[PDB]
Amino acid sequence: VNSFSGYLKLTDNVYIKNADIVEEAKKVKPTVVVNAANVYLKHGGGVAGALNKATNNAMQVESDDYIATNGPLKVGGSCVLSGHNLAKHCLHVVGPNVNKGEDIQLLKSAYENFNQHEVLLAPLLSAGIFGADPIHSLRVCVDTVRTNVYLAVFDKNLYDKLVSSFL
Numbered sequence: 001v002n003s004f005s006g007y008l009k010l011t012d013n014v015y016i017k018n019a020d021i022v023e024e025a026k027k028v029k030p031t032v033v034v035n036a037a038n039v040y041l042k043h044g045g046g047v048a049g050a051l052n053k054a055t056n057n058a059m060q061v062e063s064d065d066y067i068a069t070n071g072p073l074k075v076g077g078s079c080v081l082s083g084h085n086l087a088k089h090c091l092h093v094v095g096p097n098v099n100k101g102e103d104i105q106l107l108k109s110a111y112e113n114f115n116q117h118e119v120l121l122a123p124l125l126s127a128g129i130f131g132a133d134p135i136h137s138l139r140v141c142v143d144t145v146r147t148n149v150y151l152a153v154f155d156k157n158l159y160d161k162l163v164s165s166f167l
């Protein structure tokens with residue numbers, strides 16, 4: 001039993017809800033919140049910009065030190081950093097950004113990072129400003145993640161299409 005509330009159950013382990021991941025994380029304070037990161041951990045917009053704003057830019061400060069030490073992530077890769085005031089940990093995961101021409105096949109590799117954590121609050125990878133079809137992203141999530149994932153979809157219209165079109 002966990003403290004996630006109001007989710008629709010899609011499969012044994014995947015759940016989905018219309019919610020602002022920022023507000024969800026503050027309420028639940030999950031062990032792991034997933035960020036829709038880029039390889040440079042520059043959290044300028046989208047989910048990443050919103051999560052960083054909620055940390056008063058502490059996420060960005062920590063991220064800049066991470067990059068200065070380790071260099072950029074790989075597309076499809078991840079790193080674990082602090083969750084600041086939002087969660088215990090933040091798993092920064094880089095899905096392909098279609099608006100950069102990045103290979104959509106890497107979306108499965110991106111979701112594989114979730115399997116290293118028993119329970120996660122997450123957005124749909126490569127959705128929003130990363131340019132991929134959120135319906136496809138949900139399919140890859142369900143077919144790749146085996147741990148317990150709570151998917152937060154900010155847009156109410158998009159959420160209804162995801163559910164009503166889910167197979």
Ligand SMILES: Cc1ccc(C[C@@H](CO)Nc2ncnc3[nH]ccc23)cc1
Binds near residue numbers: 019047126127
């Ligand atoms: C119309 C539309 C907008 C955005 C998306 C992508 C989605 C991640 O896939 N973004 C988010 N998901 C959950 N909480 C969030 N808080 C801030 C951003 C955000 C798809 C479609």
Ligand SMILES: [Cl-]
Binds near residue numbers: 046127128
């Ligand atoms: Cl977005």
